[PDB]
Amino acid sequence: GQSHMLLELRTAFSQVKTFFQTKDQLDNILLTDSLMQDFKGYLGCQALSEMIQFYLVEVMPQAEKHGPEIKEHLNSLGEKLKTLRMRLRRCHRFLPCENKSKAVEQVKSDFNKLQDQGVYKAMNEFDIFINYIEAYMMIKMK
Amino acid sequence: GQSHMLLELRTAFSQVKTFFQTKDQLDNILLTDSLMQDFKGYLGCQALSEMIQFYLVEVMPQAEKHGPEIKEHLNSLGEKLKTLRMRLRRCHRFLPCENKSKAVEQVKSDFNKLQDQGVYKAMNEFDIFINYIEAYMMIKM
């Protein structure tokens, strides 16, 4: 609802709005209600996560360079959006899909340290993996 | 009734297991209960996704490189794992997290088709984006 972060994002954006609005010449809307539809549905988390990423990694760093006079405002918007994202991440109702598994990262790092042996081990343990996939499926049906 | 697709994967794997088993000299275990724990919690879709990816992208290509003499058997195993992935992705309680928003794909596609106008339009509509975030949050409650 009336979130501080949203108000922070809106306030910061209002400092650069005119600059982009005056340059936005085409009649079509980019962000359509179909986007809003996907946010509503069962892949809402993925949709929103991807849109946040798109603004943070594509739109804003490109916008930054379409003018230095707004660079500091776009950095600040970027920080605030990143902060929003990290916050949504930590609420299971919002962006739980962005959280990565530490057990997987531990697997990757052990594998890396083992080198050729990690290849032989990971493959040898592929039966373990299949068993876990099966368990995952079982647990998802309760 | 997916235990036939698992049966397949297990059968494909059983024929190459020993090639790696005899070369796996170290004592410890890579895939441990902590992983299965993660598969069982709120981030389980993500953990399973990343594991299937890890095997497809990191482990199996190296196994192919190390075991060219069974490379066909490994390709077979990889395609069965890929097939399984795709099936899980179609079932909303399995790998829903690998599905992409079509609406987002269209946004990215329009954005690229617009070039510099895309940057201007996307930034101009950042207010809309903030509204969409706000609706999303409300909806999720």
UniProtKB/Swiss-Prot annotation, chain B:
GO cellular component: extracellular space
Record keywords: Cytokine, Disulfide bond, Glycoprotein, Secreted, Signal
Keyword Signal belongs to the record: yes
Glycosylation sites: 99
GO biological process: branching involved in labyrinthine layer morphogenesis; cellular response to estradiol stimulus; cellular response to hepatocyte growth factor stimulus; cellular response to lipopolysaccharide; chronic inflammatory response to antigenic stimulus; defense response to bacterium; defense response to protozoan; interleukin-10-mediated signaling pathway
Disulphide-bonded residues: 45-97
Function comment: Major immune regulatory cytokine that acts on many cells of the immune system where it has profound anti-inflammatory functions, limiting excessive tissue disruption caused by inflammation. Mechanistically, IL10 binds to its heterotetrameric receptor comprising IL10RA and IL10RB leading to JAK1 and STAT2-mediated phosphorylation of STAT3. In turn, STAT3 translocates to the nucleus where it drives expression of anti-inflammatory mediators.
Family stated for the protein in its record: Belongs to the IL-10 family.
Protein's recorded name: Interleukin-10
